[PDB]
Structures are given as structure tokens and as C-alpha cells.
Ligand binder design. Structure first.
Ligand code: ADP
Ligand code: MG
Lengths: 516, 93, 88, 107, 98, 107, 93, 95, 86
DNA sequence: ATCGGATGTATATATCTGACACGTGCCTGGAGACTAGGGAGTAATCCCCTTGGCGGTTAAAACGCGGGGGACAGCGCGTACGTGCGTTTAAGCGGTGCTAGAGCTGTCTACGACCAATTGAGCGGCCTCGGCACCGGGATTCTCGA
DNA sequence: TCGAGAATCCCGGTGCCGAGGCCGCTCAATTGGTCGTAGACAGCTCTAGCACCGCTTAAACGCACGTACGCGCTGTCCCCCGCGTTTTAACCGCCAAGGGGATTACTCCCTAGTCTCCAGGCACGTGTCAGATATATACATCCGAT
């Protein structure tokens, strides 16, 4: 409790079978395939076979009394699932959709840990830099009686905070960004870390990441991950998530890969995914976004199969035949020919109609913006290239519409000002330029209703997150996705690969939450 | 006895680039030493190149590269043109 | 408008910053530096770099490769009479 | 079975057989290709003609018939490519280019 | 009034702290960019290696330091302490480069 | 019988056989003698021992137990004849000798 | 993929001059380059020296004259003495 | 009576146009074969060898004096002083 | 040979000869201290070149120094000379 | 601003001497078979490159300003050079004699090239634990304005 | 001028990564034997290097005189350094997918080297003659004093 007294519990003044035995005892109650990993890394790893060879219910009905305000019943179910997860010496992944509310559930579960079994910290929380304040606010609001600091600033400020509170053990939560964890590990490697919580666990995918390696060096009683969408593209990434969760069990990537992904059985189908549902049922929890929400109506996603232009065809053939050193050149040409140097006609440059018809997509694009403009709609172009987004900006100038652009080079204050002015009440702002993988999740463009994915991405999750900039809670009229695809080109290839990835994700995970 | 020299050939070139002038003995000795020095420089560069590339033979490609590496600019390109012309004429005969 | 003509990317020779020339000058042991030194330095640097790179590219062209190697650079320096120890 | 020289075949003046023998006996490589002597002889002949034309022009400017080391030196030092090629070379009985710094001349 | 160092006493300190370290004094990425720009004027579509660029940078900085030493001697010989482009030109012409 | 390396038979540390093979493969002459590799290995050993002794002295002066390019440079440039032998050589990750002209010092 | 170098030999030489003293990788590479360069200089000078006298063998006499030509001043007599010592020991054993 | 500088310029123009050797032959030969006796006793010299030595020496000295003159000019003088020769040799790398 | 070995022959490189060399170099005005410096530099150059030439001629087991040995020594030092063979 | 001298600069004429053409031998380059091994062509393969975009830290880099000291110019002056004239002296030349020792030829033998078997030395792969880099903090030293 | 105030050196503590052993294997040294053939040694020879010696006469030496130039001193700007904001770009960490150069491993052909002859091109020795000095002489032109 007292800083000096709590120093005796925080700092680390000093084959963990002690919890491993109970872990396996509870885990083998399910299907026997769970022990296949250990029967593999027992011949592979003899030291871990010493536990296999030998071999409280708190439903927590109502919303926590110790927290402020009322807590939603589905969040009650989630936090009870976290409680059950704790009282089994196992760790899981909460995977509710963005905006459903996960920070509240996590901090309510921490309040459980602190006020029902009396362990006031330490707790490490890792999140993207933009979210830290939005964590501290809920920390102070829902359970006010707790101390926490953001551990931010220049070297001097962070060192002062470390000396004042970290080594002095004057905290309960030590919320810190992804970069801070790497920056200061030695001062932070020894707090014994009851839990380590990672919001937006999409970052921890590659096992060779510096963040991954650093996090493996930490010593913690138990872990936890928060992430809206696990398994973006591959299955090995989900394996990496699970491996970080429980390295005792998921210590064999090749096993899981050859099990489903690296080798899909030559049977008809679905036996292996039934076994996957059995395996991951106790580990990962996810709920349908539309399970309790009504409100947001579903999106009217459409494809506009545009052709090609004469100059576009010429350039595309010139690229196909064989200064340019990638297949992405095809994606540039299929996108807009002006990206190349010399395509623009003449050292004198103009802005008249000589660009609209020269680009295949932008013709139908202009038609659709017009048709919506005499209908009272706003546009959220999400191209994949900032350089091309300049071309679209020039075109919008020619048509005399209103910019509001946030690329990756837009300063944070400029970003928030643009969000404010566009999302403001009635204003002269027709189109909203934006690059898909920009801004993180701190954008709430709920005023508009029409989004046009100008290009397509390799993984569908990026597009889905981009489409959530207008389909989140809030906007309650209509959503019209208008992704543009050009036929007989590499764009068809990337669309097909994205579709197969989305189907894989659907079958693997999007059948669990139906049972959940 | 019978010391070889490039005189008889330097004279043949001279009485086609200026078929009216002559050349003194000291000048001819200087020309001979110049030809020998350039030969040694080019051949040494070519041998070093062949040794670098693990090759066991010296051929027109190494000779051309050594020329292009030792002569400056216009001399290099003109000498390369002359060498390739001579090699093609030799092979087509 | 007309943003499709983005920038100039002023000059990679101007990428050699005045503090960098000043640091090299300090290692050389000079006390006061005139204001016009920073252009002569860039000129002589560019001349030296082209002289070495021409021979390095010649070597890598003869080898029928497409990647200039530390060995090619070392050979070019040795040819110019600037033997370099430490790279092979 | 009449014998005609490799120099005659290649249309050169310098000897190709002698260059081949020098390359073989000079301990440059284990083996010597067939076109290397031709290429090297052509290059030598070109360089000789290039320097010797300039020497003859200098001799004519000096109103002389036979060229001398002074004319050779004048040609080499006046031509910039040749001056760079023969930079570290001193020519016997050559001399210096007429050159006086402007500061030394009277006002 | 805050204290101030007399002109030159910080230049001397920098001199003796830079004649004692060993690292490279030019930034890495700008030098790499300059090298690629120069190289793409002899034959397009080449690539370099990190070790090649490091060796080239080493040779380059050695060259410029050795040039600045002779420039300093020329400036001192001219009864000066400030190095001027005349000194670089003289040091390069005497050395034989140009 | 029992093999005995030529290095051991000559009382050296450097590889006499490897030196002999390099001398035969380097296109230096048609034949190489028997004592030439021994002589060359002895010379190389002497030179490397000299430079390493100076470098170790420098490293011990800097209170360190590894020789680094700084110590190699500092040992080479502080010996007049070694520096004359390596006058045109540059040592990567080396440096310069601490040297400030006396005119530049404060009055 | 084998790549030879004088690393073990330079280390053996170091361990008898400074018995307790290591060496980094970069210094090792610099010493290897130094040995290669000195070998190339001596061998090339010996080759030229044998070519001038119309000999075909490189022997200890050419090597000794080459080290006398290359090594500076007082550094040359110690190398010559070491070479002669090694040659006599080898030819007597 | 001419004024200081006129005869010097005339001499510069005269000697920059000639080709012969500016050092007497026997004194230089005596110097050469006195220096030679420090390396081996009872040597003989080809006349061609002595002439080659003289021409190399003269070329070296002329090329050194040109750089010495440039050093003197750089310091705003017209008189060459020993410091100029020392600076030229030091920069050139000979010292 | 045994011909009454002499000294101070560096004084044979006389002041007018040094002045003529300076004039060919393009020097108008000459300080009086330059002659000893010139004698020193000439003596150093000659010592180096003659040392190399004598080494060559002694390796060839000869007693006569030849123009070819001198040329080889000059080329070894990097001052290639045209006009005496080679 | 014009004269009076001294110094190249053309213009003729005689004199060698050293390029240039011619004849003679022989050594080397060309023609022709024969052969083997170097290098060219094919194909796996695989790891690192490429292009376009993103987010965050944190020093360097760029800029502005004051003010000091250094460069640059001008002035005096007092040597230290240049120029010119006699006076010796030693180089340069022509000639001669002598002998050391470069240079060539013949024999033959010792020693390097080449090849087959054999096997230790050295190189690639792997692992670990000290040497050195980095970070307070305390003491010492050095500069600058009283 | 001594006492701030700043910068640097010198002590402990981490901590981390590369240097330095240890091991297996494979491939170049090593040993033994055979066979040309370079070079080593004797002998000869004839060339050129060395040593005097006399004569001429240009170049070096010594000394004078008198400018002009190198060096020291004094002002005056101006421009470069030291220092405090503030701005940005280098430098990490990432994603997403390719494919393209670089590197073995193998087969086979074709172009080098190696011989044997044998003409003919080039080196050597000789014998002109005309190109380049070697004197003279008149003219142009700078230079320095009027
Ligand atoms: N009393 C409450 N009960 C449930 N949810 C609430 C309550 N008050 C606020 N919330 C919501 O909980 C949400 C937390 O979700 P958010 O901050 O978007 O992060 P995430 O999307 O990761 O869950 C907030 O957006 C907030 O609107
Ligand atoms: Mg969230």
C-alpha cells in the first residue's frame, strides 16, 4: 500500500511448474488435441514433459459496485470471462470490435483484481501514443481511487518520473506507448509486472519485432491482449499472438502452420476449422459489433468495374514489356497515368478537362461525385497513394469543390483542426481526402455517409478499418462503399487475394463469435 | 645483339600522318619508350583484371576495359572504337 | 493548384551541410573558416567522388555484375593511388 | 599456302605477332586470347598517331621538317588529354611551356 | 550579464575534441543519396552495398581532412588564420590534382 | 615418414606452403625457388610483429587490452619509417594525430 | 565458400609479442589487408627484378633485393637479417 | 643601365625557350660519383647513366621551383624564400 | 675507383646554376638563403635515386651503373623518364 | 610626351653530320594437325533488394544578432637584393693509352616441375563470458571579468 | 589582478555483444620418385670506362652602388564566431508483395597451347645528301632616360 511498503512487492529484489500444473489440469478438460503441442515439444523439448507424464466460480452477476456509473450487460459478460480467465492461470485475447468499449472492461477487471483479491499493481499498459490520454481519462473516471502516470516526455522528464515514482513504487498503472517500452526497458524490466496489457495488439505480429523481443524479456505473472481484429492476413500471425500469450503451450509455429495453413488437408473441408474452433474457444473472445447496437445500418458495398483509357492502355503495355523496378508500376498505371513523369502533356501545364478523361477511374469518379453533389452527400476518398492524392486534389480544384486533406505528412494540430472543421455543423466541405493507413483510430468522421475506396489494399483489414471511419457509432443514415476496380489488370489480382484473405478470416474467426 | 624496337612501325605511321616530315633519333627513342610504357601499363591492368575476375586468360574484353580505365575521356573512346574496328575486321577475314 | 509537380529536392551536394564541412575542417585543425569555403569544398568533393565512382562502375561492368561492391571501390581507390585498409 | 600477316589481315601497321609474343612471355596470364593482340596493337597505333600528329604540327609551326623532343614535349603539354596521360613522365631534352605569372610582369 | 567565451576558445576546444574521436563526420543518408546521384550518370540501373558506400565515405572524408590540413598550412604561410578558397586552390594545384 | 610443416622446419609462424602456392599462382615468374617462400614468410612475420608491438604499446597507453584501428593508426603514424612505408595508405576507422599549429594557440 | 586469410598467423604472432592482449575484428581485417599489400609489393618487385635480368626463377636473392628496395632505411636490415636467419635454419634442418 | 626586373624577365623568357642542361657536367658528375661511394666502393658509371641522372635532377628542380614561385606569390611577394620551398615540399608530400 | 676521393662537391652546384634553374622555373627575384636549401634538396633526391640504382646494379652482380638501372630506379620512385631506353 | 642604346629577329651562305635508302641473313611468325580443359550455357535457389506509404524521438541544422578581432589597406624605412664590371678559374674539347669487365659460348648438373597417396592444418559453425560502451556525480582544471 | 562558472577527467556500477575457444571435416601441404633444362662456372674477347694532358675562353666570383620591396606599425570596417530559439530531417521500427541478381553444380564445345616445317620480315651494316647549325649583317622594337 504505502510506497515504501509497496516497494517490497513491486521491485524484483531477487520450468515454472507451479502454475503450469494447474494450467494443464484445467486445460486438458477440453479435447485431447491440446496436448499435441506438448507431445511434440517433449521429444523436441524434454524439460517440458515433466508435467504431462504425471497426468472458484464467481459469476459476478451485476455491474461492479466499486466502479462509477452503470456497466452494460455484454460488458458484464466480458469482464466475467476475464475473471474466469484469471482464475485458471491462463491468458486470452479480447477481440470486440472498435468502438464497442474495451478499455472500460479492462479497467473494471483491474478494479476486480485490486478490490476483490487485493493486489494494487503493478500493471503495465501498452498502447499507441495517441490513446494514452484516452486511457488515463477512463482510469481516473471509472475507478478514481488509483494512481497512474503516462510516463512521457523527453529523456529528462521520463528519468525524473522514473526516479520519483517508478523506483519509488508510487503507482498502480504505468501506461506507456509502444516506443517507450523499447526506449526504457532496463528501468522497466524489474517491477515483476502482475499483468501486461497491450491495446491494439495488431502491432505484435512479427516475432522478430524489437517490441516482441523486448516484451519476451519482461517477467510477468500473466498477460492479456486487446485487439479489434486478430488474424489480418495470415494464420502464423494468430499463432504469434497466442505464442506471446502462452509460450508454455504455443511454442511450435510449424506445428500450427502445417496443421491448417501450411498444409490444408485434402479432405472436403471444415474438419480442421472445427478443430480450430475447439482449440481457440477457451482462449479468444469476440462479439458481433451488431450484436447489441442496432443503430448503424449495414454498408451497401459495391464494385465499379471500370475499364482503361487509351493512354492508360499504352502506358500499361509499355510497363508490361521489358528505370522502373517493381510490379507496383502496374498499380500506378492502372490507378492514374499522370503519376509517371512525362505523361502530363507539355512543359506548360494546365488544369482543364484534359485529366478527367485521361484516367479511367476518375471519369466514373467525377460522375459519381456530381450525382451525389446534386443529392446532398459528402465524400471520403481513401486512396492508397499520397502522391496520387495530390492529383485528385488538383482535380477537385478544377471542379471547384472543397478540400479537407489529412495525409501522413499532416501535422497533428492540422489533423485535429481538419477533423474539427469538417465534422463541425453545416459547412462548405464536400470531399475529404485521406490516405487509408493514416491517423490510427482517432478519427470520428461520422458526419458524412459516402466513402469511396479509390484503391484496394493487400489485406482487407486495412480497408475495413478505413470504412469504419464512417460506419462507427454515430452516423445513422446510410453507408455507400464505392471501391473502384479496373479489370484485366493487376488490380483484379490484388482484389482476389484480398477476397481470399477475407474469406479465411471469416471462416476462422467470424464463426467463433456466432457461438459467442 | 638484335635488340627489338618499334622504330620501323612508328616510321610507317609517321609517313602516313605527315608524309613530308621526318624524325630524329632521340625523338624515335622517346616514341619507342612511350609505346613500351603504354604497353606495360595496359597489359598490367588487364592481367590484374583477369586475376580479379578469377579468369585464366587475357582477351579483347579485358584489353578494352583496361583501355577504358587508363585513358582519359576522348582518348579512351576513340581508342576503343579503333580497337573494336580492328578486331571485327580481323575476325571477318 | 498544379500540385502534381511536387518539389525540387534542392541538391544532394547541398546535402553536405555547412556544419559537416566545419566538422571536417576542425578535424583538419583549422580555427577560422571563411564563408566561401563551403562551396569550394562541395566542388572538390563532387570531383573526387565522380573520379572514384567512374572506375568502380567500370570494374563492376567488366565483371558483368549489377552491384558495385566494396572490392570494386577498393580496387578503384588503389588504381588512383589511395590504398584503403579495412574492407578487404 | 601463301602466308599473310595478322597485321595485314586486321589492316594495321603495328605488329600483331610481336605483341602476341610479348603478351605470352611477359607473365601476364596463363593464356592469351586471339583478339587481344589485335586490339592492343590497334590501340597502340592510334595513340602513336594521335601524339605524332600533334608533334608534326608543332614542328611545322616551328618551321622544321624533322621533329625533336622539344616538339614532342610541346605537343604533349599543350594537349590536355595527353598531358593527363603523361603526367608523371619527364621527357629527355624537352623543356617547359612558356609561362610567366601575371603579377611578375611590369605595370 | 551571462558570461561569454572569447572568439576562438571554442574553436580550439572543438579542434582538440575532433582530432581525438574516430567516427565519420558526414551524415550517412545524405552521402548515400549523393553517391547514387553521381553514379547514375555513368550507367543507369545500378545498386550499391552498404559496405561499398561506407568504404567510399571513409576514403572521401580522409581525402577532405588531408586537404584541409594543407589548406591550413597555406593560410598560415600567408600570415593568416582564416582559410579561404585561394588556399584550397593553391593546395590542390601544388599537390598535382588540378 | 612423418610430415613436418616447412614453417616449423624454418622456425616460423607464417604459412610457408601457402606463401609458396600464392607465389606460384600469382603469375610472377615461370618458376619459384625453394628459399623464396621462407624468406618472404620471415619478412612478413617481422613486419607484422613490429606493427603489432607498437599497436599493443599504444593500446596499453590508452588503458585497454584490445588493439583497434585507432591504435593501429596511432602506432603507424608515430613511427617515422613505418609511416614512410604506409604513406599513401589510409586506415579505416583510424583518425589523425593530435596536432595544433603553434600560431593558432592563444597568446 | 572457404576464404583464406592470415588471421590465425597474425594472432599467433601477437600472442608472443603481447601475451595478454586481444584484437578486434576491424583491426584483424586491417592487418590482413596490410599483409596482403606488402606481399603483393614484394612479389611484384621480385617479378620485375627477375624479368630485367632475363631470369625465369624467383629465388631468395630476388626477394632480398626486393625488400631492400621497398622497406625504408633501418627497417630493411632487420627484415633482411630475419630472412637470412630463417633461410639458413630451414636449409640446415 | 636597366632597372631591377628587366634582365630577370629577359632571362626567364630565354631559359623557358631553350632545351639544354643548365648545370655544368663535370661538377654534377663529381657529385654523383661522390654520393655513390657511400653505398658501394669502386663503382663505374655509364655516361648515359650520368646524363639520365642529370636530366632527372634538373626536371625535379625546375618543377620544384615552379611550386615555390606559386607559394611566394600566394603570400603577396615576388621573392622566393626557404619557407616557400619547405611549404611546397611539405604539401607535395616529400617532407 | 681509387682516384683521391673528394668532398664538398655539392658546392659545385653553383649559385648561377641554381639561378638558371629558377629562371626556367619562372622565378623573377631570389632571396640569398635559397641556395643552401636547394643544395640540400638536390642532395637528398640524388641520394635516394643513386641508392636504388646501386641496389639494382649490385643485384645484377655488376660493377658498372647503367642508364637502364637509373631508369628503373626513377620509375620505381615514380618519375618515369623517356629517352634512355626502356 | 621624344631620342639613344641594347637586344632579339629575319635574311644569306657555307658545313657538316646524321636521317634515310639499299643490300644481306636469319630468326621468328605463319600454316597445319592434334588435343584437352577453360569457360560458356542451363538451371535451381534464395536472400536481399525495390516502391510506396506510415508513426515517433531526438539531436543537428538553420536562422538571427551582438560584437570583437582579424583582414585589408596605407605609410615609412632600411636593408637586401638586382645590375654591371674586372679578374680568375675551371669546364669543355681533342687526343691517347690501358685494362677492367660487360657480354657471348659450351657443359653439365643440381634443382625445380609434375604426379600419385596420405593426412594433419585450417576453415565454417556454435557458444559463452569478459572487455568496453554508457551513465551519474564528484573533483579538478581552465577561462574570463573584477 | 582572484573568484565565479563551465568543461573535462575520473571514479564506480550495469549490460551486451563479439573474441576467443572447441569441434568436425576436407582439401591443400607433404613425401617420395622421375625427368628435363636453366643457370652456374670456365674461358675468351673486345668495348668502353677511366686516367692524364694541353689549350681556349666562357662562366663564376668578388665588389660597388642604388632602388624597391619586405616588414613593421596604425586604423577601419566587416564578417565570422558564440549563443539562444525553433524546425526539420536522420534514424529507427513497420507493412505488403514480388522478383532479380549472385551463387553453386554440371555438361560440353571450341579455342587456347603444343609440335613441326619453312619462307620472309626485320635487324644490321654500308653509303649518300639535305636539314639543321654556325657566322655575319641589316632591321624592329622595347626600354629608360630625357
Ligand atoms: N457507462 C458506460 N458503459 C459502457 N460504456 C461506456 C460508458 N461510458 C462510456 N462508455 C464508452 O466506452 C468506450 C470505450 O471504447 P474506446 O474508448 O473507443 O476504446 P475501444 O474501442 O478500444 O473499446 C468509450 O468510447 C465510451 O463511449
Ligand atoms: Mg480503443
Amino acid at each position: 500500500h504505502d510506497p515504501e511498503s509497496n516497494k517490497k512487492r513491486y521491485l524484483l529484489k531477487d520450468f515454472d511448474l507451479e502454475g503450469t500444473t494447474k494450467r494443464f489440469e484445467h486445460l486438458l478438460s477440453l479435447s485431447g488435441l491440446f496436448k499435441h503441442f506438448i507431445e511434440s515439444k517433449a521429444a523436441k523439448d524434454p524439460k517440458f514433459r515433466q508435467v504431462l507424464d504425471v497426468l472458484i466460480e464467481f459469476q459476478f452477476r451485476e455491474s461492479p459496485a466499486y466502479v462509477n456509473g452503470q456497466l452494460r450487460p455484454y460488458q458484464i459478460q466480458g469482464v466475467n470471462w476475464l475473471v474466469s480467465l484469471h482464475k485458471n492461470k491462463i491468458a486470452g485475447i479480447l477481440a470486440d470490435e472498435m468502438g464497442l468499449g474495451k478499455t472500460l472492461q479492462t479497467i473494471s477487471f483491474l478494479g476486480y483484481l485490486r478490490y476483490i483479491e487485493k493486489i494494487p499493481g503493478p500493471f503495465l499498459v501498452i498502447a499507441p501514443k495517441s490513446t494514452l490520454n484516452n486511457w488515463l481519462r477512463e482510469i481516473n473516471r471509472w475507478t478514481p481511487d488509483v494512481n497512474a502516470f503516462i510516463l512521457q516526455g523527453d529523456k529528462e522528464e521520463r528519468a525524473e518520473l522514473i526516479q520519483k515514482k517508478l523506483l519509488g513504487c508510487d503507482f498502480d498503472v504505468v501506461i506507456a506507448s509502444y516506443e517507450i517500452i523499447i526506449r526504457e526497458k532496463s528501468p522497466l524490466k524489474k517491477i515483476n509486472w502482475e499483468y501486461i496489457i497491450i491495446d491494439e495488439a495488431h502491432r505484435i505480429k512479427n516475432e522478430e519485432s524489437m517490441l516482441s523481443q523486448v516484451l519476451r524479456e519482461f517477467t510477468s505473472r500473466n498477460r492479456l491482449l486487446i485487439t479489434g481484429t486478430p488474424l489480418q492476413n495470415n494464420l502464423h500471425e494468430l499463432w504469434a499472438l497466442l505464442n506471446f500469450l502462452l509460450p508454455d503451450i504455443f511454442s511450435d509455429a510449424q506445428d500450427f502452420d502445417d496443421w491448417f495453413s501450411s498444409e490444408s488437408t485434402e479432405e472436403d473441408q471444415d474438419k480442421i476449422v472445427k478443430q480450430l474452433h475447439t482449440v481457440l474457444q477457451p482462449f479468444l473472445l469476440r462479439r458481433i459489433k451488431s450484436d447489441v447496437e442496432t443503430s448503424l445500418l449495414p454498408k451497401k458495398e459495391l464494385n465499379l468495374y471500370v475499364g482503361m483509357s487509351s493512354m492508360q492502355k499504352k502506358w500499361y503495355k509499355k510497363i508490361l514489356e521489358k528505370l522502373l523496378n517493381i510490379m507496383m508500376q502496374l498499380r500506378k498505371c492502372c490507378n492514374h497515368p499522370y503519376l509517371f513523369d512525362g505523361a502530363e502533356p507539355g512543359p506548360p501545364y494546365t488544369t482543364d478537362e484534359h485529366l478527367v478523361y485521361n484516367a479511367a477511374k476518375l471519369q466514373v469518379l467525377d460522375k459519381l461525385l456530381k450525382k451525389l453533389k446534386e443529392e446532398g452527400s459528402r465524400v471520403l476518398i481513401f486512396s492508397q497513394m499520397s502522391r496520387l492524392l495530390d492529383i485528385l486534389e488538383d482535380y477537385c480544384y478544377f471542379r471547384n469543390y472543397e478540400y479537407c486533406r489529412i495525409d501522413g505528412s499532416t501535422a497533428h494540430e492540422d489533423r485535429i483542426q481538419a477533423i474539427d472543421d469538417y465534422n463541425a455543423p453545416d459547412s462548405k466541405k464536400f470531399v475529404f481526402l485521406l490516405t487509408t493507413r493514416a491517423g490510427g483510430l482517432g478519427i470520428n468522421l461520422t458526419s458524412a455517409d459516402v466513402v469511396v475506396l479509390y484503391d484496394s489494399d493487400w489485406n482487407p483489414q486495412a480497408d475495413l478499418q478505413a470504412m469504419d471511419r464512417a460506419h462507427r457509432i454515430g452516423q445513422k443514415k446510410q453507408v455507400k462503399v464505392f471501391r473502384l476496380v479496373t479489370d484485366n489488370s493487376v488490380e483484379e489480382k490484388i482484389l482476389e487475394r484480398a477476397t481470399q484473405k477475407l474469406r479465411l478470416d471469416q471462416l476462422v474467426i467470424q464463426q467463433n463469435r456466432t457461438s459467442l | 645483339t638484335r635488340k627489338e624496337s618499334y622504330a620501323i612501325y612508328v616510321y610507317k605511321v609517321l609517313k602516313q600522318v605527315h608524309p613530308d616530315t621526318g624524325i630524329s633519333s632521340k625523338a624515335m627513342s622517346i616514341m619507342n619508350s612511350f609505346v613500351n610504357d603504354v604497353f606495360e601499363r595496359i597489359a598490367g591492368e588487364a592481367s590484374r583484371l583477369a586475376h580479379y575476375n578469377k579468369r585464366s586468360t587475357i582477351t579483347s574484353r579485358e584489353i578494352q576495359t583496361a583501355v577504358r580505365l587508363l585513358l582519359p575521356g576522348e582518348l579512351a573512346k576513340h581508342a576503343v572504337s579503333e580497337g573494336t574496328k580492328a578486331v571485327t575486321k580481323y575476325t571477318s577475314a | 493548384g498544379a500540385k502534381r509537380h511536387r518539389k525540387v529536392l534542392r541538391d544532394n551536394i547541398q546535402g553536405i551541410t555547412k556544419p559537416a564541412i566545419r566538422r571536417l575542417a576542425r578535424r583538419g585543425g583549422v580555427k577560422r573558416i571563411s564563408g566561401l569555403i563551403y562551396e569550394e569544398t562541395r566542388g572538390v568533393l563532387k570531383v573526387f567522388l565522380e573520379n572514384v565512382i567512374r572506375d568502380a562502375v567500370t570494374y563492376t561492368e567488366h565483371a558483368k555484375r549489377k552491384t558495385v561492391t566494396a572490392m570494386d571501390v577498393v580496387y578503384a581507390l588503389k588504381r588512383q593511388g589511395r590504398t584503403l585498409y579495412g574492407f578487404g | 599456302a601463301k602466308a599473310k600477316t595478322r597485321s595485314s589481315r586486321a589492316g594495321l601497321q603495328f605488329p600483331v605477332g610481336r605483341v602476341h609474343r610479348l603478351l605470352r612471355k611477359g607473365n601476364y596470364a596463363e593464356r592469351v586470347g586471339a583478339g587481344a593482340p589485335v586490339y592492343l596493337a590497334a590501340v597502340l597505333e592510334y595513340l602513336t598517331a594521335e601524339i605524332l600528329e600533334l608533334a608534326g604540327n608543332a614542328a611545322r609551326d616551328n618551321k622544321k621538317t624533322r621533329i625533336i623532343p622539344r616538339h614532342l614535349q610541346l605537343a604533349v603539354r599543350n594537349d590536355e588529354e595527353l598531358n593527363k596521360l603523361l603526367g608523371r613522365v619527364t621527357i629527355a631534352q624537352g623543356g617547359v611551356l612558356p609561362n610567366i605569372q601575371s603579377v611578375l610582369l611590369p605595370k | 550579464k551571462p558570461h561569454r567565451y572569447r572568439p576562438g576558445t571554442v574553436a580550439l576546444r572543438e579542434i582538440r575534441r575532433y582530432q581525438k574521436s574516430t567516427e565519420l563526420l558526414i551524415r550517412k543518408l545524405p552521402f548515400q543519396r549523393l553517391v547514387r546521384e553521381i553514379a547514375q550518370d555513368f550507367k543507369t540501373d545500378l545498386r550499391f552495398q552498404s559496405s561499398a558506400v561506407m568504404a567510399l565515405q571513409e576514403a572521401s572524408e580522409a581525402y577532405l581532412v588531408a586537404l584541409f590540413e594543407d589548406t591550413n598550412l597555406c593560410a598560415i604561410h600567408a600570415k593568416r588564420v582564416t582559410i579561404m578558397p585561394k588556399d584550397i586552390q593553391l593546395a590542390r594545384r601544388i599537390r598535382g590534382e588540378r
